[PDB]
């Protein structure tokens, strides 16, 4: 059965934007691949190199001052924010999905102001720390620094930091 989303909440630093957050986009997680064909092969296999960058793009529709003031701070990973969502499928079992993130709010975009429409500001955060819990337990935990790429509890770079001494 498909999962229709029902509830949406966004935090920035604890302040409830429950309500006026009409659109939100979590970062697409992309493995840095490379089409690799060596000697004894014809089709290229693809090899991980890590992830690429992570941009999350929510778009609030007010002159906020509670989300505007996290643009251009002297420290990255100061804007954090916590998303909360609720997909509802399979006989009312609404699974609680949260997606808490962290990083530099890299772009604040006020749209066209044609004197009578809504506000619809646009935002984009260059996510460093990204933590996605679907139904309580962990799914994606991506800390770029310290190399803590962890899938559903197990750390996929546990074998790497022992080799690198981290």
């Amino acid at each position: 059965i498909p999962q229709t989303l029902t509830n949406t909440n966004l935090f920035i630093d604890g302040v409830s934007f429950a309500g006026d957050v009409p659109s939100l986009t979590l970062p697409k997680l992309a493995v840095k691949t490379e089409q690799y064909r060596a000697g004894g092969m014809d089709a290229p296999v693809s090899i991980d190199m890590g992830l690429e960058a992570m941009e999350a793009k929510f778009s609030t529709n007010g002159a906020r001052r509670e989300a505007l003031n996290f643009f251009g701070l002297a420290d990255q990973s100061a804007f954090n924010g916590v998303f909360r969502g609720s997909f509802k499928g399979q006989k009312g079992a609404s699974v609680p999905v949260v997606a808490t993130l962290r990083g530099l709010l890299k772009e604040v975009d006020p749209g066209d102001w044609k004197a009578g429409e809504k506000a619809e500001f646009k935002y984009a955060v260059a996510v460093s720390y990204y933590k996605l819990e679907v139904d309580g337990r962990e799914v994606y935990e991506i800390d770029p620094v310290n190399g803590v790429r962890a899938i559903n509890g197990v750390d996929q770079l546990a074998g790497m930091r022992n080799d690198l001494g981290l």
């Binding site: 059965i1 229709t4 029902t6 509802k88 006989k91 009312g92």
Partner: protein, 167 residues
């Protein structure tokens, strides 16, 4: 397991009698507007959808509610109509369905009799996977697999090997 239209008709009647005590009578195919605050559910149209990959036929049904009221109580029927719309935002009717999509609510002119003049059509759509899934490809259970080797091959001597065996 899977849903039935009669399972859908019983649960929409069931929940709407709990939430609306001002609605005296919410029947799924009644007639005869016998008293003032009556609500008569209907079926408008059942339409196709993106067919899933199993034997279920995806159908979204334009469900329809008609709020029968004598004229002069138009505001008393919008308060009934606002009770139905506030239900339909998350409502799956406790039946393994998708949440219902609210469509419109307005006063209409029925083809039927107009002694109870004022009626408010409240219609909404919700998808249905009616029927059983159907398997088509392969029906070979875990009890049947034997895995021999190259010298132990042929109709003379059978490959004497089961997949659950020693450790």
């Amino acid at each position: 397991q899977a849903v039935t239209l009669e399972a859908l008709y019983a649960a929409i009647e069931q929940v709407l009698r709990e939430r609306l005590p001002e609605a005296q009578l919410i029947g799924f195919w009644p007639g005869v507007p016998e008293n003032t605050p009556a609500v008569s559910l209907e079926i408008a149209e059942l339409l196709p959808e993106r067919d899933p990959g199993t034997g279920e036929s995806a159908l979204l049904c334009r469900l329809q509610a008609r709020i029968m009221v004598p004229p002069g109580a138009d505001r008393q029927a919008v308060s009934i109509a606002c009770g139905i719309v506030r239900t339909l935002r998350e409502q799956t009717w406790n039946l393994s369905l998708q949440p219902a999509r609210f469509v419109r609510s307005a006063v209409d002119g029925s083809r039927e009799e107009l002694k109870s003049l004022r009626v408010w059509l409240v219609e909404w759509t919700q998808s249905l996977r009616l029927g059983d899934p159907e398997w088509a490809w392969e029906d070979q259970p875990p009890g049947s697999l034997m895995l021999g080797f190259d010298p132990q091959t042929g109709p003379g001597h059978e490959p004497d090997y089961f997949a659950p065996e020693a450790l």
